[PDB]
């Protein structure tokens, strides 16, 4: 019974590491969107900084 219980514990360990392997990769996708989105705001900030340079339009 202890051997069977240990096997059950090992099996649930496989499910635990299977999810956290997929979850980490899933959060890699999410971090890609925010990083690219940060690039949108990074690009936007530079463009607005140029608005003040054009004193006529600003």
């Amino acid at each position: 019974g202890n051997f069977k219980s240990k096997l059950k514990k090992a099996m649930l360990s496989q499910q635990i590491t299977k999810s956290t392997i997929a979850n980490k990769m899933r959060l890699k996708v999410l971090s890609a969107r925010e990083q690219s989105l940060d690039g949108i705001f990074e690009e936007t900030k530079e463009k607005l900084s140029g608005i003040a340079n054009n004193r006529d339009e600003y």
């Binding site: 202890n2 051997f3 240990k6 096997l7 090992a10």
Partner: protein
């Protein structure tokens, strides 16, 4: 008189009877422990298989 000698021999042999039963019972306890040691090897083998898995 001779009655004491008759009772002493029975009493002495009775004490040996209890000792013989106790020693045999102790050997039975040891036999169970030895048998469990063999079963423990199977558990050890199963644990190694679990470690391999």
């Amino acid at each position: 008189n001779g009655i004491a000698t008759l009772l002493q021999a029975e009493k002495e042999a009775h004490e040996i009877v209890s000792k013989a039963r106790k020693y045999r019972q102790d050997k039975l306890k040891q036999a169970k422990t030895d048998a469990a040691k063999e079963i423990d090897s199977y558990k050890i083998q199963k644990d190694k298989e679990l470690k391999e898995f």
